[PDB]
Design a protein around this ligand. Structure first.
Ligand code: NAG
Ligand code: NAG
Ligand code: NAG
Ligand code: NAG
Lengths: 206, 83, 289
């Protein structure tokens, strides 16, 4: 039952101050009694005027306390509401590129769900799992040209340098359609030897 | 039992070296939890669980698997309208 | 703040009168605690977004990027990066004076040494593991092969870095150096922090000085009204003190609530940057600067 505390806290604090605001009716505030009529019943008005001031001044102040709290507290909700309206627009209606705005992990989609005086999102996120230690290289010399991965990176399980996408392991034989050439070898730090297979070359020989 | 702290004078919880994830915050990174029979303890708040990523200039780690997690996220929207 | 004491010092006479204003005394503590609680929630949201504490490898080879500036200093007793010491010197009696009257400064849940372990972790994973540690288990990746991605993020093809690496190294390092003097040689950069600390210590001074004001009563010493006036009249006097002081708290409390609500907004801005900017790479123009 503690997952909803955020909502539960809002509802309580509202009902909280109301209780407090009510209980302020029963306080003397320096006046002879907290029942507005008793001051009128016991005392002649001339004097009862000054008494009722201490009630009014007390109570009238006690509202401004309550009102100011609500204003401040609403300004928090007003901020939280925009956070929702931001998520609802970006997360639910679109797909968010903002890391950990929609909740931990790469975000796929979100499902809004209503809750009393609140909203609850179900964020369907993509969390990778199982790792392998790979030896990697930023580039591969072929003929002395350098080949860099068009998307993703080079890795090598053993001798065969595999280009693959970053966030999931799908090894692929390295061909020029996976790599764009740039510069040449002597510059790139840590470039390694390999042979980048040609799609076209085999198609030829016939 | 008495244990002096950075936050104040803490009575009734035996100290422990052995630091665990925070449970009941107190102050200055002192978190108290109930378990050991059992007695309330107090200890320096441990931050997470230590890891040292094995790292080298040729070393890359690519995930070969994935999971799809659904994480509830809860927000207030409106508050009770009173007049 | 201790409402009963701050208002009525060491006097049951005054203390009894306070009961006739009801829940003011208690609801102030309920108010300030709400602040005091979420302060350690702010610091919680910002700094610890990371499941584990990572630590830098023993040997630093980043491809020419000196991080000895920003990484934890192994030789300090409280391990804090060389830069952070520049900061803790700039920012800064009020030590017990406030603490006389019931104005207490509670210790922040997280000691500074802990804050420096988070910002070590976040900085240790950022360097070694790229951005993936925010999305799950950290993935060691060659730092120079990290920066090939962060160029693809901004649209510069990675072949720029693999060719310009040495140059980019120096530009980075020489940029880090000037950050020292930017902080070292000017004390106004931290004004944002410095303003927060001042305004807090400000209102406290004001809140204290309100104890010495007559508020229409014959004197500001709560006992003098009792020792220089039979109680039946002194009752009305102490009201003007209480009404004055008790009001003067609500002024202070309301300020803190409002001011905290600003910090609460600034905290989210950090927690947003910390998540998006540090842990990821931001596509939001001029959000990260
Ligand atoms: C890689 O190997 C090291 C030991 O040399 C180990 O500590 C680390 O957890 C391994 N990482 C992966 C991705 O398997
Ligand atoms: C806590 O850890 C230390 C080792 O760091 C050990 O000596 C001690 O026995 C532990 N505390 C307990 C469980 O008594
Ligand atoms: C980082 O720079 C500092 C400057 O004082 C230097 O002493 C340190 O050896 C440098 N190297 C490392 C460890 O990154
Ligand atoms: C990968 O294997 C694990 C363990 O069997 C499984 O939980 C996960 O859903 C699988 N994902 C893929 C890549 O098929």
């Amino acid at each position: 039952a503690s997952a909803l505390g955020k909502l539960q806290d809002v509802v309580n604090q509202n009902a909280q101050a109301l209780n407090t605001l009510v209980k302020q009716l029963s306080s003397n505030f320096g006046a002879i009694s907290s029942v507005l009529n008793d001051i009128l019943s016991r005392l002649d008005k001339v004097e009862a005027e000054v008494q009722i001031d201490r009630l009014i001044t007390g109570r009238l102040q006690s509202l401004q306390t309550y009102v100011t709290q609500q204003l401040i507290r609403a300004a928090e909700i007003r901020a939280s509401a925009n956070l929702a309206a931001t998520k609802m627009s970006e997360c639910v209606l679109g797909q968010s590129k903002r890391v950990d705005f929609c909740g931990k992990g790469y975000h796929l989609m979100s499902f809004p769900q209503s809750a009393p005086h609140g909203v609850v999102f179900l964020h369907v996120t993509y969390v990778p799992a199982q790792e392998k230690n790979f030896t990697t290289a930023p580039a591969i010399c072929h003929d002395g040209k350098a080949h860099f991965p068009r998307e993703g990176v080079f890795v090598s399980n053993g001798t065969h340098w595999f280009v693959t996408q970053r966030n999931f392991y799908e090894p692929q034989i390295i061909t020029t359609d996976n790599t764009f050439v740039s510069g040449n070898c002597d510059v790139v730090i840590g470039i390694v030897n390999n042979t980048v297979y040609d799609p076209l070359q085999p198609e030829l020989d016939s | 039992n008495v244990f002096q702290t950075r936050a104040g004078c803490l009575i009734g919880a035996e100290h422990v070296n052995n630091s665990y994830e925070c449970d009941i915050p107190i102050g200055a990174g002192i978190c108290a939890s109930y378990q050991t029979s059992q007695s309330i303890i107090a200890y320096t708040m441990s931050l997470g669980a230590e890891n040292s990523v094995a790292y080298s200039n040729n070393s890359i780690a690519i995930p070969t698997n994935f999971t799809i997690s659904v994480t509830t996220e809860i927000l207030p929207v409106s508050m009770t309208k009173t007049s | 703040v201790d409402c009963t004491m701050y208002i009525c010092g060491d006097s049951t006479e005054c203390s009894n009168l306070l009961l006739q204003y009801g829940s003011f005394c208690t609801q102030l503590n309920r108010a300030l605690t709400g602040i005091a609680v979420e302060q350690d929630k702010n610091t919680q949201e910002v700094f610890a977004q990371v499941k584990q504490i990572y630590k830098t490898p023993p040997i630093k080879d980043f491809g020419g990027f000196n991080f000895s500036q920003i990484l934890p200093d192994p030789s300090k007793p409280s391990k804090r990066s060389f830069i952070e010491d520049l900061l803790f010197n700039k920012v800064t009696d009020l030590i017990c004076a406030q603490k006389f009257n019931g104005l207490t400064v509670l210790p922040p849940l997280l000691t500074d040494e802990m804050i420096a372990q988070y910002t070590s972790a976040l900085l240790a994973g950022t360097i070694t593991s790229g951005w993936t540690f925010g999305a799950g288990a950290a993935l060691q990746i060659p730092f120079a092969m990290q920066m090939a991605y962060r160029f693809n993020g901004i649209g510069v093809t990675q072949n720029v870095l693999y060719e310009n690496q040495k140059l980019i190294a120096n530009q980075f390092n020489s940029a880090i150096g000037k950050i020292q003097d930017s902080l070292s040689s000017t004390a106004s950069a931290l004004g944002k922090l410095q303003d927060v600390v001042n305004q807090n210590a400000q209102a406290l001074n004001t809140l204290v000085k309100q104890l010495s004001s007559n508020f229409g009563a014959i004197s500001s010493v709560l006992n003098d009204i009792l020792s220089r006036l039979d109680k039946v009249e002194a009752e009305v006097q102490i009201d003007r003190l209480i009404t004055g002081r008790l009001q003067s708290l609500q002024t202070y409390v309301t300020q803190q609530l409002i001011r905290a609500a600003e910090i609460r907004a600034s905290a989210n801005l950090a927690a947003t940057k910390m998540s998006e900017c540090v842990l990821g790479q931001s596509k939001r123009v001029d959000f990260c600067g």
